[PDB]
Amino acid sequence: RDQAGITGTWYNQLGSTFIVTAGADGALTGTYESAVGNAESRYVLTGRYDSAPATDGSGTALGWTVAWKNNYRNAHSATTWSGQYVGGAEARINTQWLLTSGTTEANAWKSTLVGHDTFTKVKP
Amino acid sequence: RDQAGITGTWYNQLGSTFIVTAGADGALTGTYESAVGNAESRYVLTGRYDSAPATDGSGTALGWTVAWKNNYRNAHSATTWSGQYVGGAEARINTQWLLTSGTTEANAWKSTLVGHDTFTKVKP
Amino acid sequence: RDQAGITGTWYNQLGSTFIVTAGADGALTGTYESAVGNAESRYVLTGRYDSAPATDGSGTALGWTVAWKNNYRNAHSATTWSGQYVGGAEARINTQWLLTSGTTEANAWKSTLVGHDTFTKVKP
Amino acid sequence: RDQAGITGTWYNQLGSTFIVTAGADGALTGTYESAVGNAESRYVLTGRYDSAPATDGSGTALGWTVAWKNNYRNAHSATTWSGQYVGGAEARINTQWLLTSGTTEANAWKSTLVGHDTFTKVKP
């Protein structure tokens, strides 16, 4: 269990802030603040992690979602990050993400961005 | 709000079963059973949706995660689906997904599968 | 060798037209016309396929790129499709694609769309 | 035209080597050697780039494919990279990639890896 390793405040390469609690049962709960895009302040996130990872030096699989609606803005979109937690002196969460916007059926082909974020426990 | 539209039992093209409740506040909670892969029975899922979508015929953005650990198996992996709900006679959730396995740093380049699932309210 | 199987005119679910020749050496050459987006008429494509696939009923891996510049328009973007050819009565090329736009460094996080196209030998 | 900027030898974070020539007409031709996976020596690549990019500080969109068959091995797979070239003192090609394996129809859901490579003109 990397419950203690995951729980806390993380920062990515864009200067976004991910604040998460890992539950003993595999839950992830917290808030996300994006440094970029159609976003202001904090947004709810929820997700899941592997609470019993392999003991062979592998990372810990996890993922989470943010819907980009809060009390300030609604960007009619949702991002999911999928990745793994790697513990140790320079702990990191290495992710790839999919960001889908609500679209008409005609525009569905251009609904989804893909990218990658790396989170660390220390900021830019 | 497509709270009522989203809530329920959905099936994809592989014969997997997604059982979800949509909360008024943007939460998604439920269980997932995969017809394929290193999986048996139900797994917890959690996610988020846009509870106030655009009124212009656009779909409703949403996403969710499953960590592939339950009481029967642990596949040391997590999938996130990102997509949109489209209401109407033939309601569907159109998704793309990222499935990350825990890996060593040496194998991280081959950690993540990508695919697409389409869910409907009626099964194969 | 599915050189003969691949060579020809293919259509996707959007009504786009892919015209390709497969070389004995693994080359793919041809033109692409998109039914959607910032595109008009034909664009050059090039790519590669596995000219000696497994004999066990597996599909044939292949990919190709289009840069969205021709004599009519320049959309400062490029798409790559990655996928497999499946032969037989209802032959199909099943792909996932990445479409990158040129961006400033500040906007690089939103540079790349992801999607999926299925090509068949008969049109909508 | 970043024909001169693109042409040359590039290295990614895995220690792979990409050797490319950019044509005046938008072509990319060359060889790829992977430091990882089911690969040995050089493989043919082909692709396309935007030969007339925006003059506003944007990167130059490009993509290319490798089919993982040469005279030494056949991995029954193909990778496509989609990304942009960014010129200047520390020139880089920032990419995301899709790697599809030939599979049976039953295994198609697990056919495609996704990742990201950053290429520079100087090696690890």
Ligand SMILES: O=C(CCCC[C@@H]1SC[C@@H]2NC(=O)N[C@@H]21)NCCN1C(=O)c2cccc3c(N4CCc5ccccc5C4)ccc(c23)C1=O
């Ligand atoms: O901004 C937000 C909320 C904050 C998101 C922050 C992200 S989460 C991942 C990353 N990590 C991080 O910490 N922070 C960032 N939500 C909307 C985000 N958004 C999309 O959803 C979207 C979805 C689909 C297409 C496009 C899009 N194009 C592609 C090119 C193109 C070409 C011709 C015509 C049309 C288009 C459309 C452009 C921008 C967008 C977009 C775009 O901003």
Ligand SMILES: O=C(CCCC[C@@H]1SC[C@@H]2NC(=O)N[C@@H]21)NCCN1C(=O)c2cccc3c(N4CCc5ccccc5C4)ccc(c23)C1=O
């Ligand atoms: O190795 C090569 C040639 C060299 C590729 C080098 C890459 S190009 C991108 C990157 N940049 C670079 O410079 N060098 C690397 N070709 C085959 C590569 N390859 C796939 O195509 C593949 C395709 C689909 C699934 C899987 C795969 N899983 C995912 C997890 C899973 C779980 C349960 C059961 C099954 C599976 C299957 C594992 C490995 C592979 C794989 C795998 O090695």
